[PDB]
């Protein structure tokens, strides 16, 4: 078979030029599960255009200034998290693929993180001053302990380990955003800003695939290795976690000082970061108690 | 300003971690053409299962088994080349923007260019047999010709030269499909395969829009550089063009051998390797006896493309 004694052009610009090259073949497939995603992908392509943002400017207004401060801090963070991976972490899975189809899935991931960055801009642009929209620039920049978390995954993408670069790209849709996400689902819930959360309703649609994916096709390489090595992997994959909720807890505390939603947006965040282990085929460590979110929240989320 | 004194993600990444990232900023934009360039390739997303490729049956059907071979055959070809620029090319420009917004919209170009390559197989699924699927890959796979053209141009790609490196990026939709589009246009040219053509014309819509794109942030890169640099990279381009046209010429006789569309073929590639200068900045050399197209199948090649079939 053809198949058998070729390679993918991504093979053959990174790991081996001994055969010639095959195009990709959408008439025959090796995973099923590809094509289910590729098409709820593609059918969910948005834009923030189609959202009417201009329809929260009476309960933008009903807030004050440290509340609008808080809100386009908390997206601008987002948006830095949204551009590493859209930039260089899902990207960079391509070339770690299995199949063919998921080289392309990655790309339409790079894409559509890339739209979910660019949304909190349109956001911005139809309530944030101009002043208020380079400061939190400025905050982000800044922040220490912002720039902590992805400072600690970039380097899995730039490394040669592909299961770890893939732990990496499921933590941060699948974990990372969602200590910031609260905060719109929390104002949502109290009648401010119901127009936003429209929009972010419509990033985790594509988050909550992207995380499944990742976790999914983890599970297709490390069912194939050494029990020991198995379990190499996990005390890795738990050992990075506990370090980001440490980075994550001590951001969010100065994210939300002040206005006491840390301890609430942190058991929001462990909650998904239950369902991000579970992604990867492990079970998850927390209780219910540390993973508490209000129904009025909940409601918001599962929408 | 933040901005003076921050990096993007990807520059720290791959380049500079002497300061902290910024996020991208949509708010203040330090280059208008990306936001025209942004809006353009969104608003014109597409998905070939929205196109009724089963209308081309009849026609298809009229024709014999070498002509439906020989498209099966130049279009898995096309395919090749899409994955090429999909998984490869595209996604590696990225790391080398000059701004925040052209790193998401390589992005986009990535992606799209993907849907390029699922949109012939949405063809194959309608018009081929599986016979007729898997012989054409085996072909592709086994066609040295075919294969010397994208082989010349992924080890600039994978190589640490930005400039080089997007001269191959605008060189894949400025220049090395036409010879095979060239194909489409004369059978609907004919009244065959029409609703094809459609497709063709879609992605014709995106790819000049990437041609252009990564010709205007070639020239913008190359006006920094001292005169004896700028010497230095057009007789790169120019001698790059040599090559590939080389190449090309000689995929192109064995693809059309026995039909004699070669050398019609070959017009219609120079005219676009001659485009594919004018967006780099230089002069086309090339005659116009050299590119000469006849007008029924220009008239394929310009026609806009279906706003009916947009996403
Ligand atoms: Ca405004
Ligand atoms: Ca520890
Ligand atoms: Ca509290
Ligand atoms: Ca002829």
Same mark, same amino acid.
């Given at each position: 078979?053809?198949?058998?004694?070729?390679?993918?052009?991504?093979?053959?610009?990174?790991? *081996?030029?001994?055969?010639? +090259? =095959?195009? @990709?073949?959408?008439?025959?497939?090796?995973?099923?599960?590809?094509?289910?995603?590729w098409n709820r992908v593609t059918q969910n392509?948005?834009?923030?255009?189609?959202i009417p943002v201009?329809?929260?400017?009476?309960?933008?207004?009903?807030?004050?200034?440290?509340?609008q401060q808080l809100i386009t801090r908390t997206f601008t963070g987002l948006?830095?998290?949204?551009?590493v991976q859209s930039s260089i972490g899902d990207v960079a899975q391509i070339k770690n693929s299995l199949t063919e189809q998921?080289?392309? @899935?990655?790309?339409?991931?790079?894409?559509m993180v890339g739209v979910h960055a660019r949304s909190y801009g349109t956001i911005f642009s139809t309530l944030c001053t101009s002043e208020q929209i380079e400061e939190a620039h400025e905050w982000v920049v800044d922040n220490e302990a912002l720039q902590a978390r992805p400072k600690a995954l970039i380097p899995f993408y730039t490394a040669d380990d592909p299961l770890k670069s893939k732990i990496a790209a499921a933590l941060m849709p699948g974990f990372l955003l969602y200590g910031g996400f609260y905060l719109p689902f929390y104002l949502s819930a109290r009648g401010k800003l119901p127009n936003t959360s429209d929009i972010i309703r419509l990033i985790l649609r594509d988050k909550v695939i992207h995380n499944f994916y990742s976790?999914?096709?983890?599970?297709?390489?490390?069912?194939?290795?050494?029990?020991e090595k198995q379990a190499e992997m996990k005390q890795?994959?738990?050992?990075?976690?506990?370090? +980001?909720? %440490?980075?994550?807890?001590?951001?969010?505390?100065?994210?939300? *000082? %002040?206005? %006491?939603?840390? *301890?609430?947006?942190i =058991?929001?965040?462990?909650?998904?970061?239950?369902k991000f282990l579970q992604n990867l085929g492990y079970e998850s460590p927390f209780t219910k108690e540390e993973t508490r979110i209000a129904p009025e929240v909940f409601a918001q989320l599962s929408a």
């Amino acid at each position: 078979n053809y198949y058998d004694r070729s390679v993918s052009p991504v093979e053959y610009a990174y790991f *081996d030029q001994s055969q010639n +090259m =095959r195009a @990709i073949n959408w008439n025959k497939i090796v995973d099923e599960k590809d094509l289910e995603v590729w098409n709820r992908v593609t059918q969910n392509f948005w834009l923030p255009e189609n959202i009417p943002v201009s329809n929260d400017l009476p309960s933008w207004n009903e807030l004050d200034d440290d509340w609008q401060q808080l809100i386009t801090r908390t997206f601008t963070g987002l948006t830095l998290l949204d551009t590493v991976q859209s930039s260089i972490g899902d990207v960079a899975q391509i070339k770690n693929s299995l199949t063919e189809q998921e080289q392309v @899935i990655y790309a339409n991931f790079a894409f559509m993180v890339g739209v979910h960055a660019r949304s909190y801009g349109t956001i911005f642009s139809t309530l944030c001053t101009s002043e208020q929209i380079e400061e939190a620039h400025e905050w982000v920049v800044d922040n220490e302990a912002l720039q902590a978390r992805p400072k600690a995954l970039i380097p899995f993408y730039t490394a040669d380990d592909p299961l770890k670069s893939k732990i990496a790209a499921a933590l941060m849709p699948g974990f990372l955003l969602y200590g910031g996400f609260y905060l719109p689902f929390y104002l949502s819930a109290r009648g401010k800003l119901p127009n936003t959360s429209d929009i972010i309703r419509l990033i985790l649609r594509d988050k909550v695939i992207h995380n499944f994916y990742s976790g999914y096709k983890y599970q297709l390489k490390v069912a194939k290795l050494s029990p020991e090595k198995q379990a190499e992997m996990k005390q890795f994959v738990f050992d990075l976690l506990d370090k +980001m909720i %440490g980075l994550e807890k001590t951001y969010l505390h100065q994210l939300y *000082d %002040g206005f %006491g939603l840390a *301890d609430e947006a942190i =058991r929001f965040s462990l909650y998904n970061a239950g369902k991000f282990l579970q992604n990867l085929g492990y079970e998850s460590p927390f209780t219910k108690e540390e993973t508490r979110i209000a129904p009025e929240v909940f409601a918001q989320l599962s929408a």
